[PDB]
Ligand binder design. Structure first.
Ligand SMILES: *C(=O)c1cnc2ccccc2n1
Ligand SMILES: *C(=O)c1cnc2ccccc2n1
Ligand SMILES: *C(=O)c1cnc2ccccc2n1
Ligand SMILES: *C(=O)c1cnc2ccccc2n1
Ligand SMILES: [K+]
Ligand SMILES: [Mn+2]
Ligand SMILES: [Mn+2]
Lengths: 8, 8
DNA sequence: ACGTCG
DNA sequence: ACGTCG
């Protein structure tokens, strides 16, 4: 849920 | 993830 | 259940 | 020369 590299 | 030159 | 740049 | 999460 975090999106720092993916944002899922 | 680190931004030391890109910051992704 | 998700992976990234100069 | 450096790693970023709910
Ligand atoms: C987002 O909150 C979150 C938490 N755990 C994960 C595990 C695997 C893929 C994506 C996820 N996203
Ligand atoms: C994004 O591509 C990415 C990959 N690995 C991680 C590990 C821990 C926190 C955040 C991350 N983000
Ligand atoms: C950030 O933590 C991080 C780690 N590895 C990477 C590889 C390629 C592009 C960006 C990256 N960012
Ligand atoms: C920033 O543009 C950049 C390019 N190469 C690196 C190599 C190692 C650590 C940090 C770096 N930052
Ligand atoms: K982001
Ligand atoms: Mn991964
Ligand atoms: Mn690394």
């Amino acid at each position: 849920x975090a999106x720092v590299x993916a944002x899922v």
